[PDB]
């Protein structure tokens, strides 16, 4: 997706870590509202005590995963959902699954094929989720004002849909920013109840949900940067004594 | 060992007198390690240690990888997120075996354009140049198998483009393809087999190693003047030379430390930003993405596969001349490995008498035009083939193949070079 | 005297036969196993769609296209020439294997309605992107950007071939066998 | 001359392995 | 596995072969008998023609596969059996697989632990198949008629059974030969019907199953007696010119 | 090389002229090849070449049958009947290398009492025998991961009995074997890093075997006399010397293809008598089989660790000494380590200095006893443990020790030595006379 | 007290390559340790009015077999016949019971009526399910791998088995019933 | 006396390695 909105999350950088609350609020936001359409078959629901994570206590997780019921293995047949499960797969075929959403999308790109903007701005995967929630405008672009498709809707931010021939162009591409998405736009303003009296707009959800995918997609980014400068740390201080070695030791050569 | 003059290893120690008159293994390692270096190598000299971190690296990943992954096309997928979700340190020995292959790569194409530049496939180098050119083959074949084995989109459909290369070889390519695939499509025989052969490719590749370090020991090095160490005496060789322990040792084991400082950095803050996002979706046959883009040390290969389209004069004359036994199918698949085996038999296209090229004022241009082209090959393979990239990829495949063919053949027969130093200890003492 | 090497010749003989037919089953091996060979043949039948879109089937390990074409499409004027094709067989396993590259020869049906496929392309396998995609209306493959016209007729880039279409029949007005 | 009783050696070892082999194949011992 | 009767196989010893005609036979009183429980899950339909097996004509074995209920293991759906399927699962829940039973089950031993007899008489796995079919007496032991487990039946072949009490002599050790299986005795006298008009007595059918139950868990037995011939006579072959040239070399030196 | 006088190779053609003038890699085959060998040897050295040829056959069938196994639990079983019955020679290749394994074992014991009886440990080759023993360790490590991964009952058993024995060991124990097993019982993290390993050391075990082959062309064969070649001149040399090409490539060649005939025989016509016929029925974690047996080349070792109860009287001493953390569980593990250790021991322990058993009278008898000790303690493991065969697996366990421990250093104090010939070239003369 | 400071440098930038090296092996073995599996906690109840008496029922639990019987007369009988100083162990390994207890077939029996006997079907010695069926010398159970006896009540009487067979954490709960995990 | 710089040295540059890449890292 091109021309995503470059959202600060507080997981950027090499420093950066998750706030457990804004998890706390996206599996809320998940929960309700998501979990309709999209799975998680990736995610052990046990993961949301555990650290780095959401955190939460285990008697919670408990009580969350008993909301669910599966085919278990050995009953074959409907049994309440235990934290050793898995969340479920998508109850719409349609719908994607989201376990890895964050990581399988891009929203920066180039310049010119040259991977630099990557390279500052990283993937964009959590700030392309938000630019799609985000991204259903008003008002459709009036280039195909009678003539869009029923079964779908203009998201300024997808780019894989849908056009109709009116917006299409032959000549170049296509007139429109985005593209006509299956997705029913799924946010509204104070549609979830944030028990902590948070802000429940739009924009604010769509934050929470996208940081708590971001933390569905990597749950371990916190150990990966702590290993990081761990290892860095380890190979600065060999790099040093290393230097002095060598130059110690070549100054008799001469 | 060498055939420069040098001392011998001596058993000394009561321990040492016991074994070397029963199996002289320390003797070995010795010479192994003291051999006399030329002294005025320089900073591309390092690579080769590095690549022996980066086989080392892969090895004990994939040791540690096979622990867990199931190769099987309902499992895999899943496996490799219990490997990054549930294994102890998983995310971090997976996100090092795949960066890692990178790491391998870049490490080889500075170690062969060095050697392309210092003339090192120069006569009496030609084995030690052609065993790098079979390790180079088998890194190919392992990275592309293991890059197979995730099973996301890019796995699926790179198995499946990759194996259609097979089927493009006239009369029997069908046969080859479907051995390959073990039926008439990618699926779990395919990734099986994959994973057996990725599983024993990096031991084939160590013992070329081994074969590739006893072929370069038994020419002795070459370095950035391309003269020789004085046989003569131990007088003159040790003006020369250094040994190898400790001076290029702690040389190389320093370069490697700080740059394993990077590959560390990036490995923690930014894992993802050389692979694609598309293999994180799972593989499904009955869709493509649209962003099929090989991984970027191949993107060369792929670009001269790309260049050769139908309405290409050469394609047109070929398929004529073949009388329709070559097509623009089978002529790009040519091409693409006509790249590789133009470069294997540089020891004999480059009729030059000049060893190093920083003495050779017409090849310097060449040389540089051949590294910009191959950046150029690298970037135009992650192009679409629109214009001007079609023009811009056809432009940079042509003069690959020219510099190789035409280039070096001819400015051996027409270069005026510049004269080198006496000796290495004078080229030594003119830079301190 | 050369009876001497008339015999080592012959024990190296007895070596290199137990040795070549000791080579030949660790080959072989990888050849189709005998699952994959059954699944070479199989029967189904597929239902009706609304026109101006495309279906999508799995057999043999690979996609069926089913495309029921617009009039922009079923028409295109049958503006291409047979002269002006890269390929000029039909590539029909319903016709003759003289069939030409011609607009009702690629289709199914009559009226040039409905059009069945390989959604594979001939160059190297990957499936063409539809909609209208590429500069020939049709299909655009994303691996190596061989375009395919309207009637599934390589246009442009690296692909020999038409796309193939299958052994194909209409079951009833509204479903389709394959198989 | 020469040749032909090196090269009839090995082709005599060829032929006699896969003989005696097709003889069996007729599995009446 | 019980001491069995050494029944004369056509399929023993280097040269034997299976009988097509026995092994339809087999095929045909397992599915009118066996198929009712036991399952074949490893045997895929098709090798029903294949060839040094029954060698059904493929149409047949089309029309055998369809009277199996499958549920399809990528649409969900029932179906008509196919070709391409496998056996079913055992329907009777502790009925074993007879998939590989024939070389599941040793039926000679020793003497003195040794294996000599195994290695004149085989692994006797069909004798052992034909001598539980045979095994059930038209009444049972002498001893502890009082005392039979319900819902078994005594089998003079069975050896991990279940023993009354009364029949253990005092070191916990069986006095019967055979011990009480859960199997009922499956086959009775002209229980299924031969087109040919070949012997249907309980023996008759033992046998055939018997047979067909060895071709079950060996299909490539044939091919294997075959690969087996042709690299004997390479290898002897090679043996004897190598040791002519063995001799002559060694001739040279003595 | 070897000491012994040699002619050097020299580059013929002129692409043997460059070939060798930049890698010496012609010289090395050549000078490997052409090792001047005993004129003596007897048909008991043709066991180096019969394993360097079964861990080939091992290494090209599973390269190839990893091809079509897959190492999961839902599947594994499934694809080893896959294997069976769906690949082209599938059958074959299966019964080749589980077959092959047997063949790797047997040559390996032959290989070894050559070794211990013809003196072939002794110095300068202690270097030899430890390599060997290395690679020994290697292959019982490499068959038992082989065996765990067709997933039958025999495989899940004797993973379980088999990752126990680490959990005997007293405080580390059961952490080494929760890290071997990856949890609490064995599973399919058992299966898979199993699977793993058993791919990889198959390369060790080769790479072994170069230092091993290393190992004995710097000190040169033994043979049947003990008695040196002479070093003193290529005269005498060639005396007592053939090169090993042609003349023992062809005798050890033509015997490798006599015990491949009867190998092929066995896979063609009775590929399952070595089987335990249990492994034909799937895992079932919840039933133990009526009667777990290792396969036949674990069995002495076996019988060793079951010789060893809370009963036995060194047992219980042991047990007084430490205050009970060798009870006899742990007891029975240290036994069945150190009866292959104390083998990896006898360069030290036999203190006598005549090296061919031939001439030494005595040690023959304690040879021959050791000899139908291992076939005793092979056919006792796999008896019941009650009556008599505990007294009979006691007492083959005792003499095991007592052999490597106590005869072999008293017989070289008492022993009355044979005088062997003078030289090779006489004990050849006077048998080819 | 010249060549100090190049030991000292030559020996510290050894001493750093061993730490960095020490952390760069670690993950390689630690990968080994129990990962998802670790989720060792569980509970499961099974319906104990089923098993007649001299009835064995299992169940699975931690990846391996739970043992129940409704134990006979003559288990109970011969039970308690063993003095305790007969025993090879004399402790009572039961969890639900304190630890210390005296291996007696009071502190091995599940409710105080002695009817009921719950057990790790798991032997003691290297892992092997033991055989019941009033199978062994001592009626109770053999242990197939290594010949280990166990009596009526689960206790080590002969073989190489160190203890008795464990009894985990099992109340009925329910007349009808035995909860665990 | 000898290996006074030796052992020191080690556990000088060991000791260093695991102070700055724990302590700086954590907090
Ligand atoms: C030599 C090169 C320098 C390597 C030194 C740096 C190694 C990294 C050490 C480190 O920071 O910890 C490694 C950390 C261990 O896991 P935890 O920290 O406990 O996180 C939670 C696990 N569930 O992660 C790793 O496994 C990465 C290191 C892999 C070992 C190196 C690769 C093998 C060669
Ligand atoms: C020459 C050395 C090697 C190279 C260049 C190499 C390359 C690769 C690459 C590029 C991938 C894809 C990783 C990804 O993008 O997710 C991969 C995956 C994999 N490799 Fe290797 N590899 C090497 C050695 C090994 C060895 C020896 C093993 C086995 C012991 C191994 C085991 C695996 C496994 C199991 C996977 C799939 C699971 C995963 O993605 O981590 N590798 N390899
Ligand atoms: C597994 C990958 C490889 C490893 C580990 C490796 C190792 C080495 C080492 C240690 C050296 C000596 C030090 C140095 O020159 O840097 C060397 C030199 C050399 N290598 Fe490689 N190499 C590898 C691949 C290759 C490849 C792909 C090529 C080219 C096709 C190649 C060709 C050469 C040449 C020409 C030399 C110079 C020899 C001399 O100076 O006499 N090697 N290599
Ligand atoms: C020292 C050499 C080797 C030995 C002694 C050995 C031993 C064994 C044994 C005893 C089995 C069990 C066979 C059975 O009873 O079904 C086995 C299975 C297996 N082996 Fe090996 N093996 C060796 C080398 C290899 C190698 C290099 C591979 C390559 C992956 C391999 C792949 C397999 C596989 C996939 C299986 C399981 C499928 C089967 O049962 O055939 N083996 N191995
Ligand atoms: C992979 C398995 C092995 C292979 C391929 C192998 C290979 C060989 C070969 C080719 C020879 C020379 C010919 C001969 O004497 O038979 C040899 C000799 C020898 N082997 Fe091994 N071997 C193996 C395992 C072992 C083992 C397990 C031991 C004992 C622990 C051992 C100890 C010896 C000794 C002592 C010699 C005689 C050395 C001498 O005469 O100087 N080897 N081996
Ligand atoms: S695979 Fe279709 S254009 Fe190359
Ligand atoms: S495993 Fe239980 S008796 Fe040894």
Same mark, same amino acid.
């Given at each position: #997706?091109?021309?995503?909105?470059?959202?600060?999350?507080s997981?950027?950088?090499?420093?950066?870590?998750?706030?457990?609350?804004?998890?706390?609020?996206?599996?809320?936001?998940?929960?309700?509202?998501?979990?309709?359409?999209?799975?998680?078959?990736?995610?052990?629901?046990?993961?949301?005590?555990?650290?780095?994570?959401?955190?939460?206590?285990?008697?919670?997780?408990?009580?969350?995963a008993?909301?669910?019921?599966?085919?278990?293995?050995?009953?074959?047949?409907?049994?309440?959902?235990?934290?050793?499960?898995?969340?479920?797969?998508?109850?719409?075929?349609?719908?994607?699954?989201?376990?890895?959403?964050?990581?399988?999308r891009?929203?920066?790109?180039?310049?010119?094929?040259? #991977?630099?903007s990557?390279?500052?701005?990283?993937?964009?995967?959590?700030?392309?989720?938000?630019?799609?929630?985000?991204?259903?405008?008003?008002?459709?672009?009036?280039?195909?004002?009678?003539?869009?498709?029923?079964?779908?809707?203009?998201?300024?931010?997808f780019?894989?849909?849908?056009?109709?021939?009116?917006?299409?162009?032959?000549?170049?591409?296509?007139?429109?920013?985005?593209?006509?998405?299956?997705?029913?736009?799924?946010?509204?303003?104070?549609?979830?109840?944030?028990?902590?009296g948070?802000?429940?707009?739009?924009?604010?959800?769509?934050?929470?949900?996208?940081?708590?995918?971001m933390?569905?997609?990597?749950?371990?980014?916190?150990?990966?940067?702590?290993?990081?400068?761990?290892?860095?740390?380890?190979?600065?201080?060999?790099?040093?004594?290393?230097?002095?070695?060598?130059?110690?030791?070549?100054?008799?050569?001469? | 060992?060498?055939?420069?003059?040098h001392?011998?290893?001596?058993?000394? =120690?009561?321990?040492?007198?016991?074994?070397?008159?029963?199996?002289?293994?320390?003797?070995?390692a010795?010479? =192994?390690?003291?051999?006399?270096?030329?002294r005025?190598?320089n900073?591309?000299?390092?690579?080769?240690?590095?690549?022996?971190?980066?086989?080392?690296?892969?090895?004990?990943?994939?040791?540690?990888l096979?622990?867990?992954?199931?190769?099987?096309?309902?499992?895999?997928?899943?496996?490799?997120?219990?490997?990054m979700?549930?294994?102890?340190?998983?995310?971090?020995?997976?996100?090092?075996?795949?960066?890692?292959?990178?790491?391998?790569?870049?490490?080889?194409?500075?170690?062969?354009?060095?050697?392309?530049?210092?003339?090192?496939?120069?006569?009496?180098?030609?084995?030690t140049?052609?065993?790098?050119?079979?390790?180079?083959?088998?890194?190919?074949?392992?990275?592309?198998?293991?890059?197979?084995?995730?099973?996301?989109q890019?796995?699926?459909?790179?198995?499946?483009?990759?194996?259609?290369?097979?089927?493009?070889?006239?009369? %029997?390519?069908?046969?080859?393809?479907?051995?390959?695939?073990?039926?008439?499509?990618?699926?779990?025989?395919t990734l099986?087999?994959?994973?057996?052969?990725?599983?024993?490719?990096?031991?084939?590749?160590?013992?070329?190693?081994? %074969?590739?370090?006893?072929?370069?020991?038994?020419?002795?090095?070459?370095?950035?003047?391309?003269?020789?160490?004085r046989? =003569?005496?131990?007088?003159?060789?040790?003006?020369?030379?250094?040994?190898?322990?400790?001076?290029?040792?702690?040389?190389?084991?320093?370069?490697?430390?700080?740059?394993?400082?990077?590959?560390?950095? %990036?490995?923690?803050?930014?894992?993802?930003?050389?692979g694609?996002?598309?293999?994180?979706?799972?593989?499904?046959?009955?869709?493509?993405?649209?962003?099929?883009?090989?991984?970027?040390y191949?993107?060369?290969?792929?670009?001269?596969?790309?260049?050769?389209?139908a309405?290409?004069?050469?394609?047109?004359?070929?398929?004529? %001349?073949?009388?329709?036994?070559?097509?623009?199918?089978?002529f790009?698949?040519?091409?693409?490995?006509?790249?590789?085996?133009?470069?294997?038999?540089?020891?004999?296209?480059?009729?030059?008498?000049?060893?190093?090229?920083?003495?050779?004022?017409?090849?310097?241009?060449?040389?540089?035009?051949?590294?910009?082209?191959?950046?150029?090959?690298?970037?135009?393979?992650?192009?679409?083939?629109?214009?001007?990239?079609?023009?811009?990829?056809?432009?940079?495949?042509?003069?690959?193949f020219?510099?190789?063919?035409?280039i070096?053949?001819?400015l051996?027969?027409?270069?005026?070079?510049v004269?080198?130093?006496?000796?290495?200890?004078?080229?030594?003492?003119a830079?301190? | 005297?050369?009876?001497?090497?008339?015999?080592?010749?012959?024990?190296?003989?007895?070596?290199?036969?137990? *040795?070549?037919?000791?080579?030949?089953?660790?080959?072989?091996?990888?050849?189709?196993?005998?699952?994959?060979?059954?699944?070479?043949?199989?029967?189904?039948?597929?239902?009706?769609?609304?026109?101006?879109?495309?279906?999508?089937?799995?057999?043999?390990?690979?996609?069926?296209?089913?495309?029921?074409?617009?009039?922009?499409?079923?028409?295109?004027?049958?503006?291409?020439?047979?002269?002006?094709?890269?390929? *000029?067989?039909?590539?029909?396993?319903?016709?003759?294997?003289?069939?030409?590259?011609?607009?009702?020869?690629?289709?199914?049906?009559?009226?040039?309605?409905?059009?069945?496929?390989?959604?594979?392309?001939?160059?190297?396998?990957?499936?063409?992107?539809?909609?209208?995609?590429?500069?020939?209306?049709?299909?655009?493959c994303?691996?190596?950007?061989?375009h395919?016209?309207?009637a599934?007729?390589?246009?442009?880039?690296?692909?020999?071939?038409?796309?193939?279409?299958?052994?194909?029949?209409?079951?009833?007005?509204?479903?389709?066998?394959?198989? | 001359?020469?040749?032909?009783?090196?090269?009839?050696?090995?082709?005599?070892?060829?032929?006699?392995?896969?003989?005696l082999?097709?003889?069996?194949?007729?599995?009446?011992?």
């Open positions: #997706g091109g021309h995503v909105e470059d959202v600060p999350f997981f950027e950088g090499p420093f950066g870590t998750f706030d457990q609350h804004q998890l706390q609020r996206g599996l809320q936001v998940y929960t309700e509202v998501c979990a309709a359409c999209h799975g998680m078959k990736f995610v052990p629901i046990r993961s949301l005590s555990e650290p780095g994570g959401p955190e939460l206590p285990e008697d919670q997780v408990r009580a969350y008993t909301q669910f019921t599966v085919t278990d293995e050995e009953t074959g047949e409907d049994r309440e959902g235990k934290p050793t499960d898995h969340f479920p797969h998508s109850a719409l075929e349609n719908a994607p699954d989201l376990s890895l959403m964050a990581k399988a891009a929203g920066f790109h180039g310049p010119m094929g040259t #991977g630099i990557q390279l500052f701005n990283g993937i964009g995967g959590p700030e392309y989720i938000y630019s799609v929630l985000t991204g259903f405008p008003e008002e459709p672009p009036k280039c195909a004002e009678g003539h869009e498709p029923d079964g779908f809707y203009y998201n300024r931010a780019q894989n849909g849908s056009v109709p021939d009116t917006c299409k162009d032959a000549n170049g591409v296509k007139t429109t920013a985005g593209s006509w998405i299956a997705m029913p736009p799924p946010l509204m303003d104070d549609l979830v109840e944030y028990a902590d948070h802000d429940a707009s739009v924009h604010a959800m769509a934050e929470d949900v996208s940081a708590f995918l933390w569905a997609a990597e749950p371990k980014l916190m150990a990966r940067k702590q290993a990081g400068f761990t290892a860095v740390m380890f190979l600065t201080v060999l790099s040093v004594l290393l230097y002095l070695t060598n130059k110690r030791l070549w100054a008799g050569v001469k | 060992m060498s055939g420069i003059p001392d011998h290893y001596e058993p000394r =120690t009561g321990i040492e007198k016991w074994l070397h008159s029963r199996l002289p293994i320390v003797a070995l010795y010479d =192994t390690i003291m051999i006399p270096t030329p005025n190598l900073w591309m000299w390092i690579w080769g240690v590095v690549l022996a971190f980066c086989l080392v690296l892969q090895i004990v990943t994939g040791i540690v096979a622990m867990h992954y199931t190769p099987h096309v309902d499992l895999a997928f899943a496996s490799v997120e219990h490997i979700r549930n294994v102890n340190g998983g995310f971090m020995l997976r996100y090092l075996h795949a960066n890692g292959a990178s790491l391998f790569f870049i490490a080889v194409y500075l170690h062969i354009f060095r050697g392309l530049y210092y003339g090192s496939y120069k006569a009496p180098r030609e084995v140049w052609i065993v790098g050119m079979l390790i180079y083959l088998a890194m190919m074949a392992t990275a592309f198998m293991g890059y197979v084995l995730p099973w996301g890019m796995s699926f459909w790179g198995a499946t483009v990759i194996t259609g290369l097979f089927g493009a070889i006239p009369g %029997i390519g069908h046969s080859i393809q479907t051995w390959l695939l073990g039926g008439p499509a990618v699926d779990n025989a099986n087999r994959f994973f057996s052969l990725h599983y024993l490719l990096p031991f084939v590749i160590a013992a070329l190693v081994a %074969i590739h370090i006893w072929a370069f020991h038994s020419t002795g090095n070459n370095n950035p003047t391309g003269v020789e160490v046989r =003569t005496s131990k007088a003159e060789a040790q003006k020369d030379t250094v040994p190898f322990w400790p001076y290029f040792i702690i040389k190389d084991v320093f370069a490697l430390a700080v740059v394993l400082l990077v590959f560390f950095a %990036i490995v923690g803050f930014m894992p993802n930003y050389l694609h996002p598309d293999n994180y979706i799972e593989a499904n046959p009955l869709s493509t993405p649209a962003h099929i883009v090989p991984e970027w191949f993107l060369p290969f792929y670009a001269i596969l790309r260049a050769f389209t309405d290409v004069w050469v394609v047109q004359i070929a398929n004529f %001349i073949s009388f329709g036994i070559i097509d623009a199918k089978f790009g698949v040519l091409a693409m490995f006509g790249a590789i085996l133009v470069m294997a038999l540089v020891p004999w296209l480059d009729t030059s008498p000049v060893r190093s090229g920083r003495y050779r004022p017409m090849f310097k241009i060449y040389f540089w035009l051949l590294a910009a082209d191959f950046v150029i090959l690298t970037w135009v393979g992650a192009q679409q083939t629109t214009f001007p990239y079609d023009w811009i990829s056809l432009i940079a495949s042509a003069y690959w020219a510099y190789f063919l035409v070096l053949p001819i051996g027969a027409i270069e005026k070079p004269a080198p130093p006496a000796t290495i200890e004078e080229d030594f003492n830079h301190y | 005297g050369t009876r001497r090497d008339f015999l080592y010749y012959a024990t190296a003989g007895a070596g290199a036969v137990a *040795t070549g037919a000791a080579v030949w089953p660790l080959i072989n091996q990888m050849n189709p196993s005998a699952d994959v060979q059954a699944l070479a043949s199989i029967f189904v039948d597929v239902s009706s769609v609304e026109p101006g879109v495309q279906l999508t089937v799995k057999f043999l390990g690979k996609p069926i296209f089913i495309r029921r074409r617009t009039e922009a499409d079923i028409e295109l004027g049958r503006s291409v020439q047979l002269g002006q094709l890269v390929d *000029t067989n039909a590539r029909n396993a319903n016709i003759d294997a003289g069939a030409e590259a011609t607009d009702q020869n690629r289709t199914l049906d009559e009226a040039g309605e409905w059009l069945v496929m390989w959604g594979v392309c001939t160059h190297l396998g990957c499936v063409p992107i539809g909609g209208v995609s590429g500069d020939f209306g049709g299909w655009f994303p691996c190596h950007g061989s395919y016209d309207s599934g007729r390589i246009r442009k880039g690296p692909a020999p071939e038409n796309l193939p279409i299958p052994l194909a029949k209409f079951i009833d007005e509204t479903t389709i066998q394959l198989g | 001359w020469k040749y032909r009783y090196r090269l009839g050696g090995f082709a005599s070892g060829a032929l006699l392995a896969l003989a082999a097709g003889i069996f194949s007729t599995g009446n011992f």
